[PDB]
Amino acid sequence: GSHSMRYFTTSVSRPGRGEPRFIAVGYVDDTQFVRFDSDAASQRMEPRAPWIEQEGPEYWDLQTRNVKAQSQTDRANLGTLRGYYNQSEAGSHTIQMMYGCDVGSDGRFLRGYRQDAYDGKDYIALNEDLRSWTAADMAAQITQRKWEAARVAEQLRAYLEGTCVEWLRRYLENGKETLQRTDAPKTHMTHHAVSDHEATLRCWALSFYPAEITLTWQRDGEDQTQDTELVETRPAGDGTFQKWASVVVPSGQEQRYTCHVQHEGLPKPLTLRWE
């Protein structure tokens, strides 16, 4: 029922080979809806979902402006961090940033985020109170003093508590048929002989949205973790997700095992048992 809005920005320096590579993506829950890539032809924020296309020219120009300013600040930022960590111009470096908010099913504000990383490690983060920072080291403490002096937290908090939640609620209404749908997983079980004493049972959950799902094995109505495998949730490529779970069972005892499936799209949990 709960909803999220996320913007991920990545900036990779490519010494000699030119200006840094910049990539920005926008998500509403598990669905990507916008993109910006510095290497692309357009030089614009681009739609990635059919719903967001309905937005006017002022929105697309303001989104282009804000994302271009981000990529350009990252180029200055990549140079400044080389200065702070006394690093060479020969090596490749990455800047990562996450911005976004969380709303409840009723639409109320739950949480705001602003976090930055340098080379896969935490640099600086806005705390949950949206009023203080956490700096990962001495270099991130130079940035902290600047941001505290310039009142960066107050501007961010105003964007998160205002702007972020209003646009998300708007996306959820305009993108309702995709964003708020709860595609129940289509389920099935497969069977494979391992030896003539042991067999593998595989429990499948396909075409589900959102990505959150619980798949569990039971032996005679009791929790089974031993001789089990669970793959991480994967995109099918068309907006839906996939998952499977397996158990290695003794031959002839297949009927004793059940696979329990839990998803938002199911009114009651489904139980699967081999024939």
Partner: peptide, 9 residues
């Protein structure tokens, strides 16, 4: 909506 948030380090 991604707001203008170009802060320098």
């Amino acid at each position: 909506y991604f707001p203008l948030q170009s802060y320098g380090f």
